Structures are given as structure tokens and as C-alpha cells.
Amino acid sequence: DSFVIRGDEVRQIAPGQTGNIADYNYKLPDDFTGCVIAWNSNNLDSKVG
Amino acid sequence: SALGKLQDVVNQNAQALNTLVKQLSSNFGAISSVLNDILSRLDKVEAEV
Numbered sequence: 001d002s003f004v005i006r007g008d009e010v011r012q013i014a015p016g017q018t019g020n021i022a023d024y025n026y027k028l029p030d031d032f033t034g035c036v037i038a039w040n041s042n043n044l045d046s047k048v049g
Numbered sequence: 050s051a052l053g054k055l056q057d058v059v060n061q062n063a064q065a066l067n068t069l070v071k072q073l074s075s076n077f078g079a080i081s082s083v084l085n086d087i088l089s090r091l092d093k094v095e096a097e098v
Contacts (some may be wrong), residue, residue, distance in 0.1 A: 016094040030093065 004045055010038045
């Protein structure tokens with residue numbers, strides 16, 4: 001599964017979390033077997049203005 | 050006190066049940082001994098532990 005979020009929100013991408021991303025955008029299950037891999041993309045996804 | 054053997058056999062079963070019920074009040078190292086209170090103070094994985 002793939003998406004972009006602000007760097008602060010990576011802590012909501014874990015099993016059993018809450019907060020607007022985990023609540024309304026991407027809910028992981030509690031019994032998740034898997035890996036969450038995250039990296040900064042300011043040099044790719046950000047733009048002037 | 051003549052019936053001491055029968056009255057003792059009543060008192061031990063009462064003592065055992067009052068002890069079994071009183072142990073619901075104990076924490077066992079948990080944050081609170083009230084089960085709905087744990088489920089209010091904490092989010093899912095912390096409450097589960």
C-alpha cells in the first residue's frame with residue numbers, strides 16, 4: 001500500500017493507532033503482520049507556492 | 050458452639066467466596082482495578098496490556 005503524508009503523521013501509521021489519518025484515511029488492523037517503510041520526499045513532492 | 054464442626058464448614062465457604070469477590074477490587078499491577086476505567090484512560094494497545 002502506498003501514499004504521501006506529512007512527516008509528523010508517520011506515527012499514526014502503526015497497528016491500533018488513532019488520529020485523523022488512522023481514523024479517516026488509512027486504518028491498519030491490530031493483528032497486522034507487515035512492515036511500515038517511510039521516507040522524506042521534500043526534494044520530490046514539494047513545489048514553489 | 051456445640052455444632053462447631055457444621056458452623057465452621059459454613060464459615061469457611063462464606064470466607065472463601067468473600068475472598069474470591071474481594072479479589073475483583075485488586076490491581077495486580079494494572080493502572081486501575083475497574084475494567085471500564087482502563088478502557089477509558091488508555092488507547093487500544095496500551096489498554097490491552
